[PDB]
Amino acid sequence: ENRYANLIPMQEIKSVEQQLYPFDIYNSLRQEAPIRYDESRNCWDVFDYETVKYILKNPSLFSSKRAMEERQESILMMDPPKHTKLRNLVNKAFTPRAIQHLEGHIEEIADYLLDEVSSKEKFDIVEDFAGPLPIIVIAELLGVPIQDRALFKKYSDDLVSGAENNSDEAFAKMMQKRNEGVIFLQGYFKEIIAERQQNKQEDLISLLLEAEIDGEHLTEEEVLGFCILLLVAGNETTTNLITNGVRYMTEDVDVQNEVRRDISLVPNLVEETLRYYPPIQAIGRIAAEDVELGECKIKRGQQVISWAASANRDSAKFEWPDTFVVHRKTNPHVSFGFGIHFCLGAPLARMEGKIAFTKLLEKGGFSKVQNQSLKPIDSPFVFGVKKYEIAFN
Ligand code: HEB
Ligand SMILES: CCCCCCCC(=O)O
Ligand SMILES: CCCCCC(=O)O
């Protein structure tokens, strides 16, 4: 069928171990052919850094309109000029300057979460820390109560899940799970939107209902698209940033110790986690016209999957591509994308990661619980684990 290839795993990724560390496979594929058509998924894969960046930089050539006849009327799936107008509503809300005032409060949220576990021998960094903290932050930004964090996590995670394979049964099981998260989350936000239409508040949702574009209010679908995209993007990725950073720091305790002993290295650590364990592995696009990249001729309308996970380790751009380095003078990864769709939340994600890692490090040395069976999140464009247990020494 005409299915989104970014939800369907490559055939080159087979075992669970490979899902937990697919980067050697991506590097082999990059070397064999940095651009290849995958007949199992009816798409091109692009693995090299230069071409990924070129795709993201050329929205006129590679369109973001890739909704799978799905309910995603958000800027993520829009092209200029509509993308420009809707994004200009929110861009000033997510700058470094706009968020600086949240620093103390995010530190307070992290302190409170680590207090719920101080007297716990071992704990799940996902359930007890990395999961809650991003959800709490984005809910306060949106103006939405989320006191049942586990409920919203479940359905937010649903909207990112992919297919086990390219079969018909796997795709149907995937759409069933995605549809459940749409029902609850669309419904919840429709109710909050109606509540804000009746009585405005000092929150993002209320601002979106007052804002005018081309002399008219936003459609309900458009406000809903903002609400869900901001919710899901705001928490699912950031949780994997924190978890993946804690994963690497308990796989390589040398790095953990170094950064704990020189806390000014936390920003580099955040960037290197994003490069080395990118929460988002692949970004989709649709060819807007025929495009000749190499010898490879991309025909208008074909799916084009750009692998940030591979671009981040392209040795043509990165020294020591497969080594975790906390002393890099620059780190031009594409884990937040590039160009007009560049991650709106990157300053917020970077602040949350910086505070999350700092609070963990300051609480002392910590180790992974050995003899656990890690479970990768079931989505091929995501990289993270469902659970990750650690303990303080
Ligand atoms: C708050 C909020 C938020 C947050 C926190 C975030 C966080 C994040 N994120 Fe973001 N993003 C977002 C919001 C967000 N986000 C949005 C809204 C978007 C869309 C934009 C446009 O489209 O323009 C993005 C976008 C984006 C992109 C691009 C895509 C394309 O190109 O298409 C990427 C890659 C990302 C990633 C990410 C990560 C990795 C993280 C963590 C770490 N993001
Ligand atoms: C983080 C990926 C984008 C999430 C927003 C799209 C919601 C949906 O699937 O309907
Ligand atoms: C938060 C947006 C990540 C990009 C997901 C995709 O391109 O399918």
Short mmCIF file of C-alpha atoms and ligand atoms in Angstrom, two decimals:
data_model
loop_
_atom_site.label_atom_id
_atom_site.label_comp_id
_atom_site.label_asym_id
_atom_site.label_seq_id
_atom_site.Cartn_x
_atom_site.Cartn_y
_atom_site.Cartn_z
CA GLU A 1 0.00 0.00 0.00
CA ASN A 2 0.96 3.69 0.19
CA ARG A 3 2.34 3.57 3.72
CA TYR A 4 4.77 5.82 5.58
CA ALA A 5 8.15 4.11 5.31
CA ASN A 6 9.50 5.80 8.46
CA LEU A 7 7.19 3.56 10.51
CA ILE A 8 8.38 0.30 8.87
CA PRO A 9 11.73 -1.21 9.96
CA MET A 10 14.53 -1.85 7.50
CA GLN A 11 15.11 -5.52 6.77
CA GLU A 12 18.75 -5.02 7.78
CA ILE A 13 17.58 -4.68 11.42
CA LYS A 14 16.63 -8.14 12.69
CA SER A 15 17.49 -8.99 16.30
CA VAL A 16 16.72 -7.13 19.51
CA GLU A 17 20.43 -6.47 20.06
CA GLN A 18 20.48 -4.74 16.66
CA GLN A 19 17.51 -2.55 17.57
CA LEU A 20 19.36 -1.58 20.77
CA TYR A 21 22.47 -0.62 18.74
CA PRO A 22 21.78 -0.28 15.00
CA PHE A 23 24.64 2.11 14.28
CA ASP A 24 27.16 -0.44 12.96
CA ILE A 25 24.53 -1.55 10.43
CA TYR A 26 23.84 2.05 9.41
CA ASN A 27 27.57 2.67 8.89
CA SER A 28 27.91 -0.44 6.71
CA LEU A 29 24.89 0.66 4.67
CA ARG A 30 26.32 4.18 4.33
CA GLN A 31 29.59 2.80 2.97
CA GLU A 32 27.95 0.24 0.66
CA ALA A 33 25.62 2.87 -0.84
CA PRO A 34 24.89 6.18 0.97
CA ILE A 35 21.66 6.44 -1.09
CA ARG A 36 19.62 3.34 -1.92
CA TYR A 37 16.04 2.49 -2.84
CA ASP A 38 14.45 -0.03 -0.45
CA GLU A 39 11.80 -2.07 -2.27
CA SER A 40 10.54 -3.54 1.02
CA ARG A 41 9.46 -0.01 2.09
CA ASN A 42 9.04 1.83 -1.24
CA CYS A 43 11.40 4.62 -0.25
CA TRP A 44 14.92 5.94 -0.60
CA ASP A 45 17.21 5.84 2.43
CA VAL A 46 19.85 8.59 2.67
CA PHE A 47 22.73 7.86 5.04
CA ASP A 48 25.49 10.41 4.37
CA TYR A 49 25.69 13.68 6.27
CA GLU A 50 26.02 15.97 3.27
CA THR A 51 22.92 14.65 1.51
CA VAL A 52 20.73 14.48 4.62
CA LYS A 53 21.46 18.17 5.28
CA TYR A 54 20.79 18.96 1.62
CA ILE A 55 17.38 17.28 1.81
CA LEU A 56 16.41 19.13 5.00
CA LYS A 57 17.68 22.44 3.57
CA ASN A 58 15.54 22.23 0.39
CA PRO A 59 11.86 22.19 1.41
CA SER A 60 10.92 23.23 -2.14
CA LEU A 61 12.46 19.96 -3.35
CA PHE A 62 11.60 17.64 -0.43
CA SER A 63 8.17 18.26 1.05
CA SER A 64 7.15 17.66 4.66
CA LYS A 65 3.56 16.81 3.59
CA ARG A 66 3.84 13.15 4.55
CA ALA A 67 0.72 12.59 6.67
CA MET A 68 -0.44 9.00 6.09
CA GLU A 69 -3.98 10.22 5.43
CA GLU A 70 -3.49 10.76 9.18
CA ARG A 71 -4.82 13.39 11.56
CA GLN A 72 -1.76 15.67 11.70
CA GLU A 73 -2.64 19.26 10.78
CA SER A 74 0.49 20.53 12.50
CA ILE A 75 3.46 22.56 11.28
CA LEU A 76 5.54 19.36 11.25
CA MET A 77 3.57 18.25 8.17
CA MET A 78 3.28 21.66 6.48
CA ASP A 79 5.28 23.40 3.78
CA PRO A 80 5.83 27.12 3.24
CA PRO A 81 4.01 29.45 3.21
CA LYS A 82 1.49 27.93 5.64
CA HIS A 83 4.27 26.43 7.75
CA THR A 84 5.88 29.85 8.00
CA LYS A 85 2.74 31.60 9.25
CA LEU A 86 1.80 29.00 11.89
CA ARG A 87 5.37 28.61 13.14
CA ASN A 88 5.74 32.40 13.43
CA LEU A 89 2.96 32.27 16.02
CA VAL A 90 5.02 30.14 18.39
CA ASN A 91 8.69 30.67 17.57
CA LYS A 92 9.18 33.42 20.17
CA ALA A 93 7.78 31.14 22.91
CA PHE A 94 10.67 28.64 22.74
CA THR A 95 13.79 30.77 22.46
CA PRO A 96 16.58 30.51 25.06
CA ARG A 97 15.45 33.90 26.40
CA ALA A 98 11.79 32.88 26.66
CA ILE A 99 12.54 29.78 28.73
CA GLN A 100 15.34 30.94 31.03
CA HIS A 101 12.81 31.67 33.78
CA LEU A 102 11.90 27.96 33.90
CA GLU A 103 15.41 26.95 35.04
CA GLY A 104 14.74 27.06 38.77
CA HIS A 105 11.38 25.35 38.38
CA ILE A 106 12.79 22.52 36.26
CA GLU A 107 15.51 22.05 38.89
CA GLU A 108 12.72 21.82 41.49
CA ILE A 109 10.86 19.17 39.49
CA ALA A 110 14.03 17.09 39.19
CA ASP A 111 14.82 17.46 42.89
CA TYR A 112 11.30 16.29 43.79
CA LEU A 113 11.51 13.26 41.49
CA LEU A 114 14.91 12.18 42.82
CA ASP A 115 13.49 12.49 46.34
CA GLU A 116 10.83 9.87 45.56
CA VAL A 117 13.73 7.44 44.96
CA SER A 118 16.44 8.41 47.46
CA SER A 119 15.43 5.52 49.76
CA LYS A 120 15.01 3.09 46.83
CA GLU A 121 17.77 0.55 46.26
CA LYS A 122 17.14 0.47 42.50
CA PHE A 123 14.69 2.34 40.28
CA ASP A 124 13.59 2.70 36.65
CA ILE A 125 15.12 5.91 35.35
CA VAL A 126 12.31 5.96 32.76
CA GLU A 127 9.28 5.61 35.01
CA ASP A 128 10.65 7.58 37.96
CA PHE A 129 12.60 10.45 36.33
CA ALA A 130 13.16 10.75 32.58
CA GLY A 131 9.48 10.07 31.81
CA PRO A 132 7.75 12.31 34.33
CA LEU A 133 9.96 15.38 34.09
CA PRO A 134 9.47 16.21 30.37
CA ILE A 135 5.73 15.50 30.60
CA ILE A 136 5.33 17.81 33.62
CA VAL A 137 7.23 20.58 31.85
CA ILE A 138 5.36 20.51 28.56
CA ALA A 139 1.97 20.24 30.25
CA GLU A 140 2.66 23.42 32.24
CA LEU A 141 3.80 25.15 29.02
CA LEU A 142 0.62 24.11 27.19
CA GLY A 143 -1.65 25.05 30.09
CA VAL A 144 -3.12 21.55 30.36
CA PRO A 145 -3.49 19.54 33.57
CA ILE A 146 -1.71 16.22 33.35
CA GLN A 147 -1.90 14.71 36.83
CA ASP A 148 -2.17 11.15 35.48
CA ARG A 149 1.26 11.13 33.87
CA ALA A 150 1.19 7.39 33.15
CA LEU A 151 -2.06 7.77 31.18
CA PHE A 152 -0.73 10.52 28.92
CA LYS A 153 2.61 8.76 28.49
CA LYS A 154 0.82 5.61 27.30
CA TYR A 155 -1.16 7.42 24.59
CA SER A 156 1.62 9.83 23.67
CA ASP A 157 3.86 6.80 23.12
CA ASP A 158 1.10 5.27 20.98
CA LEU A 159 1.37 8.12 18.45
CA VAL A 160 5.05 7.30 17.78
CA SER A 161 4.85 3.50 17.58
CA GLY A 162 5.64 1.76 14.34
CA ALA A 163 5.10 -1.57 12.61
CA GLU A 164 6.95 -4.75 13.48
CA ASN A 165 7.57 -5.31 9.74
CA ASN A 166 6.07 -4.42 6.35
CA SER A 167 3.33 -7.07 6.60
CA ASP A 168 -0.36 -6.22 6.49
CA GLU A 169 -1.00 -7.58 9.99
CA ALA A 170 1.85 -5.57 11.51
CA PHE A 171 0.57 -2.38 9.92
CA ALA A 172 -2.99 -3.00 11.10
CA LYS A 173 -1.80 -3.67 14.65
CA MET A 174 0.17 -0.41 14.45
CA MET A 175 -2.76 1.69 13.23
CA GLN A 176 -4.95 0.19 15.98
CA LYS A 177 -2.49 1.32 18.66
CA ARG A 178 -2.02 4.74 17.04
CA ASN A 179 -5.79 5.16 16.73
CA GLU A 180 -6.25 4.62 20.49
CA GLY A 181 -3.88 7.49 21.28
CA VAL A 182 -5.65 9.71 18.75
CA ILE A 183 -9.04 9.02 20.33
CA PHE A 184 -7.99 9.90 23.86
CA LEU A 185 -5.59 12.75 23.08
CA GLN A 186 -7.75 14.45 20.45
CA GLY A 187 -10.71 14.13 22.78
CA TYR A 188 -8.83 15.48 25.79
CA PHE A 189 -7.57 18.51 23.89
CA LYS A 190 -10.95 19.16 22.27
CA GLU A 191 -12.36 19.43 25.79
CA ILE A 192 -9.55 21.69 27.05
CA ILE A 193 -9.89 23.85 23.93
CA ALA A 194 -13.61 24.27 24.56
CA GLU A 195 -12.83 25.11 28.19
CA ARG A 196 -10.36 27.78 27.07
CA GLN A 197 -12.74 29.14 24.42
CA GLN A 198 -15.28 29.75 27.19
CA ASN A 199 -12.75 31.23 29.66
CA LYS A 200 -9.27 32.22 28.50
CA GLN A 201 -6.18 31.61 30.63
CA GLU A 202 -2.55 32.73 30.55
CA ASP A 203 -1.35 29.72 28.59
CA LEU A 204 -0.30 28.66 25.12
CA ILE A 205 -3.65 27.13 24.15
CA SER A 206 -5.45 30.39 24.95
CA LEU A 207 -2.89 32.35 22.92
CA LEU A 208 -3.49 30.05 19.94
CA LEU A 209 -7.25 30.69 20.15
CA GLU A 210 -6.75 34.47 20.17
CA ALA A 211 -4.13 34.56 17.40
CA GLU A 212 -5.21 35.58 13.90
CA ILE A 213 -3.67 34.50 10.59
CA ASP A 214 -4.83 36.16 7.35
CA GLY A 215 -7.66 37.83 9.23
CA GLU A 216 -9.10 34.67 10.78
CA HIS A 217 -8.79 32.52 13.87
CA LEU A 218 -7.09 29.15 13.69
CA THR A 219 -9.35 26.23 12.82
CA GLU A 220 -10.02 23.80 15.67
CA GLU A 221 -7.96 21.21 13.75
CA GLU A 222 -5.01 23.61 13.66
CA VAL A 223 -5.06 24.36 17.38
CA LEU A 224 -5.43 20.61 17.98
CA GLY A 225 -2.46 19.94 15.70
CA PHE A 226 -0.32 22.32 17.74
CA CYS A 227 -1.51 20.79 21.02
CA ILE A 228 -0.75 17.16 20.14
CA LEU A 229 2.51 17.83 18.31
CA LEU A 230 3.81 19.96 21.17
CA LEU A 231 2.74 17.36 23.73
CA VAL A 232 4.22 14.32 21.97
CA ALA A 233 7.40 15.99 20.69
CA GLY A 234 7.91 17.74 24.02
CA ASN A 235 8.03 14.55 26.12
CA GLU A 236 8.74 11.40 24.09
CA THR A 237 12.04 12.62 22.67
CA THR A 238 13.29 14.34 25.82
CA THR A 239 12.63 11.22 27.85
CA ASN A 240 14.84 9.25 25.47
CA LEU A 241 17.53 11.93 25.60
CA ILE A 242 17.74 11.57 29.37
CA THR A 243 17.44 7.77 29.42
CA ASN A 244 19.96 7.33 26.60
CA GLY A 245 22.40 9.66 28.34
CA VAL A 246 22.05 7.64 31.55
CA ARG A 247 22.42 4.46 29.52
CA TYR A 248 25.69 5.63 28.01
CA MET A 249 26.94 6.95 31.38
CA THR A 250 26.40 3.51 32.97
CA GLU A 251 27.88 1.66 29.98
CA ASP A 252 31.01 3.88 30.09
CA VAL A 253 31.46 4.99 33.71
CA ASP A 254 34.63 6.89 32.77
CA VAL A 255 32.46 9.55 31.08
CA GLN A 256 30.06 9.61 34.04
CA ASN A 257 32.92 10.25 36.46
CA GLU A 258 34.61 12.86 34.25
CA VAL A 259 31.44 14.95 33.88
CA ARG A 260 30.46 14.61 37.52
CA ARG A 261 33.93 15.95 38.37
CA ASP A 262 33.70 18.84 35.86
CA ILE A 263 30.01 19.77 35.67
CA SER A 264 30.68 22.47 33.06
CA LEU A 265 30.86 19.53 30.63
CA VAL A 266 27.12 18.74 30.94
CA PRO A 267 26.18 20.81 27.83
CA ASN A 268 28.74 18.87 25.73
CA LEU A 269 27.38 15.65 27.23
CA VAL A 270 23.86 16.61 26.17
CA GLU A 271 25.01 17.30 22.62
CA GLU A 272 27.04 14.09 22.45
CA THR A 273 24.13 11.99 23.68
CA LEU A 274 22.00 13.54 20.93
CA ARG A 275 24.69 12.77 18.32
CA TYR A 276 25.57 9.25 19.54
CA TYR A 277 22.15 8.03 20.79
CA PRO A 278 19.73 10.27 18.84
CA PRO A 279 16.18 10.09 20.19
CA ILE A 280 14.98 10.57 16.59
CA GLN A 281 16.85 8.40 14.10
CA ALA A 282 15.16 9.19 10.78
CA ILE A 283 13.24 12.10 9.28
CA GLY A 284 10.81 11.64 6.43
CA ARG A 285 10.19 13.75 3.34
CA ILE A 286 8.33 13.41 0.04
CA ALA A 287 9.96 14.36 -3.25
CA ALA A 288 8.17 17.45 -4.58
CA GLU A 289 9.74 17.13 -8.07
CA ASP A 290 12.17 14.81 -9.81
CA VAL A 291 15.57 15.15 -8.13
CA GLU A 292 18.91 13.71 -9.22
CA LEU A 293 21.12 13.26 -6.15
CA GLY A 294 23.98 11.05 -7.31
CA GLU A 295 23.45 8.62 -10.11
CA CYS A 296 20.25 8.07 -8.09
CA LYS A 297 17.20 9.64 -9.74
CA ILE A 298 14.43 10.37 -7.24
CA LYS A 299 11.05 10.67 -8.93
CA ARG A 300 8.48 13.22 -7.78
CA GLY A 301 6.26 11.90 -5.01
CA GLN A 302 8.61 9.22 -3.72
CA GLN A 303 9.32 8.81 -0.02
CA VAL A 304 12.79 9.92 1.11
CA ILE A 305 13.98 8.82 4.57
CA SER A 306 17.00 10.74 5.92
CA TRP A 307 18.92 8.86 8.62
CA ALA A 308 20.15 11.32 11.23
CA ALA A 309 21.57 8.40 13.21
CA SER A 310 23.91 7.61 10.30
CA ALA A 311 24.65 11.22 9.39
CA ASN A 312 25.74 11.82 13.00
CA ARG A 313 28.47 9.17 12.57
CA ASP A 314 29.51 10.02 8.99
CA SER A 315 33.29 10.07 9.25
CA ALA A 316 33.46 12.70 6.49
CA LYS A 317 32.01 15.19 9.00
CA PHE A 318 32.86 13.89 12.49
CA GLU A 319 36.18 12.96 14.02
CA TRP A 320 35.93 9.80 16.12
CA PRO A 321 32.39 9.19 14.80
CA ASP A 322 31.75 6.03 16.85
CA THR A 323 33.37 7.27 20.09
CA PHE A 324 31.56 9.19 22.85
CA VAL A 325 33.57 12.42 23.24
CA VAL A 326 32.64 15.07 25.83
CA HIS A 327 35.35 17.51 24.71
CA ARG A 328 34.33 18.20 21.11
CA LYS A 329 34.84 21.82 20.08
CA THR A 330 31.85 21.60 17.72
CA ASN A 331 29.03 19.07 17.40
CA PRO A 332 26.96 19.76 14.24
CA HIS A 333 24.67 16.76 14.59
CA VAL A 334 21.29 16.71 12.88
CA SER A 335 19.38 15.22 15.81
CA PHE A 336 17.14 18.30 15.85
CA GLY A 337 16.87 18.37 12.05
CA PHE A 338 18.03 21.30 9.95
CA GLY A 339 16.46 24.28 8.23
CA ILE A 340 12.95 25.65 8.44
CA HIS A 341 11.59 22.68 10.44
CA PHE A 342 14.52 22.68 12.90
CA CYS A 343 13.27 21.55 16.30
CA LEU A 344 11.27 24.31 17.95
CA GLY A 345 11.94 22.83 21.37
CA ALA A 346 15.70 22.41 21.13
CA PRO A 347 16.46 25.08 23.80
CA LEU A 348 13.93 23.48 26.11
CA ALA A 349 15.18 19.94 25.46
CA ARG A 350 18.75 21.11 26.08
CA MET A 351 17.77 22.77 29.37
CA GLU A 352 15.83 19.70 30.55
CA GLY A 353 18.70 17.39 29.64
CA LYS A 354 21.25 19.67 31.27
CA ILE A 355 19.28 19.81 34.53
CA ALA A 356 18.34 16.11 34.48
CA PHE A 357 21.96 15.00 34.06
CA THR A 358 23.28 17.55 36.58
CA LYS A 359 20.85 16.47 39.32
CA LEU A 360 21.66 12.79 38.70
CA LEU A 361 25.41 13.41 38.74
CA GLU A 362 25.25 15.58 41.87
CA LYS A 363 23.35 12.86 43.74
CA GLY A 364 26.42 10.63 43.32
CA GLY A 365 27.87 7.78 41.33
CA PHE A 366 25.36 5.37 39.85
CA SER A 367 25.46 2.02 38.07
CA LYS A 368 23.22 0.01 35.77
CA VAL A 369 21.35 -2.92 37.28
CA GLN A 370 23.13 -5.81 35.56
CA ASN A 371 21.19 -8.77 34.16
CA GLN A 372 18.28 -6.80 32.69
CA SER A 373 16.69 -7.53 29.31
CA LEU A 374 16.36 -4.13 27.64
CA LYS A 375 13.27 -3.60 25.49
CA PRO A 376 13.63 -1.18 22.57
CA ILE A 377 10.76 1.19 21.89
CA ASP A 378 8.77 -0.32 19.02
CA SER A 379 9.32 2.33 16.38
CA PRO A 380 12.14 2.27 13.80
CA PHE A 381 12.53 6.09 13.69
CA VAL A 382 12.95 6.26 17.50
CA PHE A 383 15.93 5.14 19.60
CA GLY A 384 15.38 4.42 23.27
CA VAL A 385 14.34 1.72 25.70
CA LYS A 386 11.06 1.25 27.54
CA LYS A 387 12.76 0.81 30.93
CA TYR A 388 16.26 1.21 32.33
CA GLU A 389 17.09 0.39 35.93
CA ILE A 390 19.96 2.00 37.83
CA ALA A 391 21.02 2.35 41.45
CA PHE A 392 23.13 4.87 43.36
CA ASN A 393 26.35 3.49 44.82
C1 HEB B 1 8.64 21.74 23.63
C2 HEB B 1 8.57 21.31 22.37
C3 HEB B 1 9.61 20.29 21.82
C4 HEB B 1 10.58 19.61 22.46
C5 HEB B 1 10.94 19.61 23.97
C6 HEB B 1 11.29 18.85 21.45
C7 HEB B 1 12.33 18.00 21.69
C8 HEB B 1 13.01 17.30 20.70
N1 HEB B 1 12.73 17.32 19.37
FE1 HEB B 1 11.55 18.69 18.38
N2 HEB B 1 10.09 19.75 17.42
C9 HEB B 1 9.03 20.36 18.05
C10 HEB B 1 8.84 20.48 19.43
C11 HEB B 1 9.69 19.98 20.41
N3 HEB B 1 10.72 19.04 20.19
C12 HEB B 1 8.16 20.88 17.02
C13 HEB B 1 6.83 21.63 17.29
C14 HEB B 1 8.68 20.57 15.83
C15 HEB B 1 8.09 20.94 14.45
C16 HEB B 1 8.80 22.22 13.93
C17 HEB B 1 8.41 22.53 12.50
O1 HEB B 1 7.88 21.62 11.82
O2 HEB B 1 8.65 23.68 12.03
C18 HEB B 1 9.89 19.84 16.07
C19 HEB B 1 10.76 19.36 15.12
C20 HEB B 1 11.74 18.39 15.36
C21 HEB B 1 12.56 17.73 14.32
C22 HEB B 1 12.54 18.01 12.78
C23 HEB B 1 11.63 17.09 11.97
C24 HEB B 1 11.54 17.51 10.52
O3 HEB B 1 12.51 18.10 9.97
O4 HEB B 1 10.48 17.26 9.88
C25 HEB B 1 13.36 16.88 14.97
C26 HEB B 1 14.39 15.92 14.34
C27 HEB B 1 13.05 16.97 16.41
C28 HEB B 1 13.67 16.21 17.39
C29 HEB B 1 13.58 16.42 18.77
C30 HEB B 1 14.42 15.80 19.77
C31 HEB B 1 15.53 14.76 19.52
C32 HEB B 1 14.06 16.31 20.94
C33 HEB B 1 14.59 16.03 22.35
C34 HEB B 1 15.86 15.71 22.55
N4 HEB B 1 12.07 17.91 16.61
C1 LIG B 2 7.00 13.02 17.43
C2 LIG B 2 6.43 12.68 16.08
C3 LIG B 2 5.24 13.53 15.67
C4 LIG B 2 4.03 13.42 16.60
C5 LIG B 2 2.81 14.21 16.16
C6 LIG B 2 1.92 13.48 15.16
C7 LIG B 2 0.66 12.90 15.79
C8 LIG B 2 -0.01 11.72 15.06
O1 LIG B 2 0.70 10.71 14.87
O2 LIG B 2 -1.20 11.82 14.69
C1 LIG B 3 9.53 15.25 16.22
C2 LIG B 3 9.60 14.99 14.72
C3 LIG B 3 10.47 13.79 14.38
C4 LIG B 3 10.49 13.43 12.90
C5 LIG B 3 9.65 12.19 12.63
C6 LIG B 3 9.41 11.80 11.17
O1 LIG B 3 10.03 12.45 10.30
O2 LIG B 3 8.62 10.87 10.93
#
